[PDB]
A paper describes a structure:
We placed a [name] tag after the C-terminal EGFP tag on Msd5HAUS7, separated by a flexible linker, generating a [name]-tagged [name] augmin N-clamp version ([name]-N-clamp). Tubulin co-sedimentation assays showed that [name]-mediated dimerization decreased the apparent Kd approximately tenfold to ~40 nM. Compared to our cryo-EM reconstruction of the wild-type augmin N-clamp, the local estimated resolution for the [name]-N-clamp was substantially improved and the more distal coiled-coil regions of the [name]-N-clamp were better visible at low threshold level. Subsequent recentering of particles on the asymmetric unit, combined with additional rounds of focused 3D classification and 3D refinement, further improved the cryo-EM reconstruction to secondary structure level for the entire CH6 domain and MT-proximal segments of Msd5HAUS7 and Dgt4HAUS8. This enabled highly confident rigid body docking of the augmin N-clamp model predicted by AF2 and revealed the binding site and orientation of the augmin N-clamp on MTs. In this configuration, the conserved basic patch in the augmin CH6 domain is positioned to directly bind to the MT surface, indicating that it centrally contributes to orienting augmin on the MT lattice.
Branching microtubule nucleation is a key mechanism for mitotic and meiotic spindle assembly and requires the hetero-octameric augmin complex. Augmin recruits the major microtubule nucleator, the γ-tubulin ring complex, to pre-existing microtubules to direct the formation of new microtubules in a defined orientation. Here, we identify the minimal conserved microtubule-binding unit of augmin across species and demonstrate that stable microtubule anchoring is predominantly mediated via the calponin homology (CH) domain in [name]/[name]. Using cryo-electron microscopy and molecular dynamics simulations in combination with AlphaFold structure predictions, we show that the [name] [name]/[name] CH domain binds microtubules at the inter-protofilament groove between two adjacent β-tubulin subunits and thereby orients augmin on microtubules.
Author numbering:
A (entry chain B): 1 to 427
B (entry chain J): 10 to 145, 155 to 164
C (entry chain E), D (entry chain G): 1 to 436
Amino acid sequence: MREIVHIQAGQCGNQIGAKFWEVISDEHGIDPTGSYHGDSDLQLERINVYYNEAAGNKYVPRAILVDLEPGTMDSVRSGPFGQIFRPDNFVFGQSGAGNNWAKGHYTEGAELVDSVLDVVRKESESCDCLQGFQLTHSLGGGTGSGMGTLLISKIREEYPDRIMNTFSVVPSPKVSDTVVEPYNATLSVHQLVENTDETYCIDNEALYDICFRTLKLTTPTYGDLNHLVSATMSGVTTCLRFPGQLNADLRKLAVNMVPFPRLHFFMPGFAPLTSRGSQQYRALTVPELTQQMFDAKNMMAACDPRHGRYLTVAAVFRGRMSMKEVDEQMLNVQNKNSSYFVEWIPNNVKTAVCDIPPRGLKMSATFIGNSTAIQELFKRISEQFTAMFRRKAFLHWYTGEGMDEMEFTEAESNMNDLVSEYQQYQD
Amino acid sequence: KAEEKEQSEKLHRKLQGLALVHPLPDELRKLIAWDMFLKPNQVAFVHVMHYLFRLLDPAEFKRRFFWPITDKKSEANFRSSTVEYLKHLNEKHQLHWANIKSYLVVMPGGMRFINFLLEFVGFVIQELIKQREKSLSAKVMARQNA
Amino acid sequence: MRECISIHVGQAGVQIGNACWELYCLEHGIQPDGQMPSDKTIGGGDDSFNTFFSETGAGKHVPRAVFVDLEPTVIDEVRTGTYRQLFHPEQLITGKEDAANNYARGHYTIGKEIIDLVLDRIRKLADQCTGLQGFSVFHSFGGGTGSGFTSLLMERLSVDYGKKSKLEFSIYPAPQVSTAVVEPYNSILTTHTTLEHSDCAFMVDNEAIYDICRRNLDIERPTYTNLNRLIGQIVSSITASLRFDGALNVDLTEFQTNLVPYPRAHFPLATYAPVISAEKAYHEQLSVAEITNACFEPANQMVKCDPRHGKYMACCLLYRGDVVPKDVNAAIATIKTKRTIQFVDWCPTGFKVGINYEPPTVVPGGDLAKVQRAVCMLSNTTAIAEAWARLDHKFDLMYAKRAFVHWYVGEGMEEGEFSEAREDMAALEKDYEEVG
Amino acid sequence: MRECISIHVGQAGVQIGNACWELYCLEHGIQPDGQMPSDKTIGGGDDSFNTFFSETGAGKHVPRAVFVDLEPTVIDEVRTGTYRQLFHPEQLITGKEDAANNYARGHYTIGKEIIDLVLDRIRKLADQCTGLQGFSVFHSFGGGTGSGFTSLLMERLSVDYGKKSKLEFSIYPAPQVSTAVVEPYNSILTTHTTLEHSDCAFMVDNEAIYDICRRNLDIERPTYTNLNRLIGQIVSSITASLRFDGALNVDLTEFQTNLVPYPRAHFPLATYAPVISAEKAYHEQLSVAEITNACFEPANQMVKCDPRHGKYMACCLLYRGDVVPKDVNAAIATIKTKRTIQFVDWCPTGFKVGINYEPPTVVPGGDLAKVQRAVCMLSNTTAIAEAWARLDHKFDLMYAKRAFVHWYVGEGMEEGEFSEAREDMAALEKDYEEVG
């Protein structure tokens, strides 16, 4: 078999993770009780990637729910699919992280981490051939940022040969809970550079601007942002969950997408963009899907891909379409825009098609770009970090947990080194 | 018409002066004239703006603009980006430029455009003065040097 | 008997294999359960098809095939499809984890865990052969299993079976249908390691097949199912001399002897005619002269190159269906007078001609029309080096910056193996230039 | 065999072609699907119709035709009409954008994009001929595709096929049925550029055909369908010597040799009799003497001119149906004594006489009666210059003010080409005067 263990850490991680499970359970014909009611054998052929089989033909997510406070996890348990999760896989604290990375990484999360690793081990011991791990979290908070990166480092110590993938929600001043989000994000980006093989950069700025400007939502909620994230996560994971021409695993994806070990930060995109409850009556054509998936307005990282170059690209088309028309349109984009792809990586654009569309669409396209333009996201966090750090503003919340100012100076420098490395391969 | 001519000449002098410090690219050198914006002149507009933006912030220009212009689409993009950048500058530096509207970029020419450009060029010159002041009669200097 | 074992490696090899075996069953009148109802000979009738099939004691004809993939997905489609009952379950070998488009992972890491199981299954089929001729290996150059596991398999087959001929059917990567950026690396690495182990390799350029499907079949966007059906006709036309009673290429050793003058220059250019859409099946039937003249048109070749820029070392014309030797000789004489056909000076300006009277069969509900006559031209030409130069140029561009090399080194491959493989390809390009 | 390829260019050429091929199928007993049920000869019967048809291996007779238009509209009517199955789809060539009644757009702009495709299709038909004689080109002088694309085609045919005869069937423009003001310009420009490439051109004046349909068929307002049916009978009577066994004009070279004493004076006047309405089909059948005397009446000519104002250089009488040579000779002797027939002094006062015993066929439900005998007179006469003078006068009136010239210059044509074409037409008028 080819199993994946899913982890969801902190408020944002558990909310997005719960929506991901709701979306993929419905694509696999799994009800909120874990029972199968689908109409196609293709829904079960690779179900074991994300689900364990349980007594009485029940499917249970291979999901681990982690928080330092009970409030989000009780909300998930009361949610539409809250009963599908293994009850033993709810691991939680009582003290909370208080939007502090040091509490998540050094204190409150360091007391809880061994209890999470025991659940990770119990799920991994039940796999026939574990591919790797996936984490859903935010870099702006305390639990998802600090405890999520502590968990990544501990998983890499226990499972050094297994792939580590992340869906990382990047903070923005447009969708901000606290002023210390740049500190938490810079400290976490340093840990991701060393300890992950794939990181999907999900920018709350891009999600908000999509909801507001493209979907015409005057007051986007976290529920509207998480709808876009769950659709993108379904898109990216399609080649793992369904049979196709590329029998993909996480390692084949990483080997194709990551030319340099530090440059594994991806810009995800989705087409067509839909809002929750809005039915699109018109299916797009293949040319319209291919044009939209390469538009900066469909990217979930707030960077312009025209300000850099693509190292590598993966494109996942879903639904019944002419595979010839897909190749012709993908080659048309490359040949017209060849300057935006690096020439020293031949055939760096890979395309897959799956016949099973996502719910409510006849056809969709998911985009994954490794672009040097991702440096704009790190520059924007760096500027916000340095603006406070030059005055030692708010540092007393971290030094009170035992952090040194030198750990901040190292994380700032390692993030500037990552920006310089992206600039080198851009030129 | 007399006022328009005077302002246009003033603009020409300022551009000539700038060219003494920062040489004009070959394409722009051929276009530069005292009456180049008395009538709408799209070609001169593009090259003058290109020149001034590069003087102001080459890095920002590279980020915001695609150059050289090769097609109609790229040209339209250049105009839009020009309006956006000018607005940004107006806000950032509090220049109080009125009516930075699409018309400055659609039919660049006439009194209104010349006045605007004069202000803009003035701004660029002021920024350069600041830079030079930080770093630090013509007849007397010349004789002394000789 | 003169048995052949077919080996289908990775997604491309398995999917082409599945299309070829469907077509072989249709041509021999074998049902999807392996029964042959016209076979009144409970014993040795026209024993020619026993080259590719083994009769079981239940009257079921089973392919002399092995299917290998490092992931289950593509072989599970074979286990569940129309021909699920044709194969024995032991012939369908699946790993758990794939090579992820990496030659080194397919050769050194995951390939090493499965290779001994594959060799045991091949040995069980070889032990059922009275006079095993050789192997026909189907794989892709661009994909990690198709490159890395095939090179490891070809080495081990040369050790266990060093007097048995090995023929390859290799899919050359095309940008328009390409799933990986690293396909040039996988292609150069596998070609280097298989070069001393192959006796004859039939390259199929996905770009050539895609363009033939667009131009001749009016398919706006060909799928792998459309490509593999066309590939299956070409493979069927090549193997038709081994499957039916005929005068030319009655063994695997005759292919090498007729097509391969130099051991390294073992890449014959295939050309197939006619390719006609099923909607045009009621049109005027092409003459022997028209189909033979279509073999010298670059638009119908299986590799994108121009034979007018090179020389012919060998040329074989394999006809199927309603063809008389008189009309073939008249067509060849007209072609020799009208076409730029430069042979090399040391090789006779001779066409070898095979005629099989069994007409081409087409898959019911396929894109191809039923034709009364077809021709497959197999020509060893120096112009096939234009396909190597295109691959080498893409290799050199990425390798000059060491782009993606760390994925191969991370699987324990040495960086020196890239330079060695590229040097051997430069020697192959020079061998083709010196002959041309 | 002695094959001929017909080429139909632009709306007028295509619509006349469609009417001619309908009539040829009826005369040879070929059905609209291309089957010939009376052909008990699975092989070479009366092989004369193989001049215009190619037998396919399915027993289907396909026209040796190419249809070309720069717009799809008129050829899509052929693709959907009664004879849609007769033609091969490759013989029906359509552009996307038309020449918009401009010679320069038809020759230099849009014609240049399609010419190489047309020459490839003509070559595919020529390669199926054992002994290609030549080409028969059908076009209009007034229309932009019929003028500009035909001149470009005739030049390129003279390059690729410089020993093959080229016959034209050219529609001369008439004010009453004229769609463009610039028809005189298009006519002079095309006549200039085709003059050195044509071996023999049959002009058909739309005004003459329109008046014959009004006077003889009692049709108050003839449509192009009525005109093209009459044109189809004349064309059928001209080509009848190439399609059936007969003694006179058995090849294209015999037309030039019998009708064209000087290379520039290659415009024979056609005259056809009898033209009788289908309602009058039960009337008294005309004698050989009456139909021959009707050939010397200007009211029955295909070009409006008066041969009494000029001289005859050549005269051919082509009879069809129930005609005996004795009655033809008696009719000619009576005509020579009663009519002003001035021949030129240096040419024998000789009539060439062809008799084909195959009676004229008429389209079922057409406007023409079935007749027992018909005659087509082909005469090279200097009085045909009256049609050039009428065209030149209209050219000169517009060109003196440079009216509409900017439409041709806007397509990249030089203004000098108008003066050159007009000077060559003035030289042609003078050549006709010097002979007369």
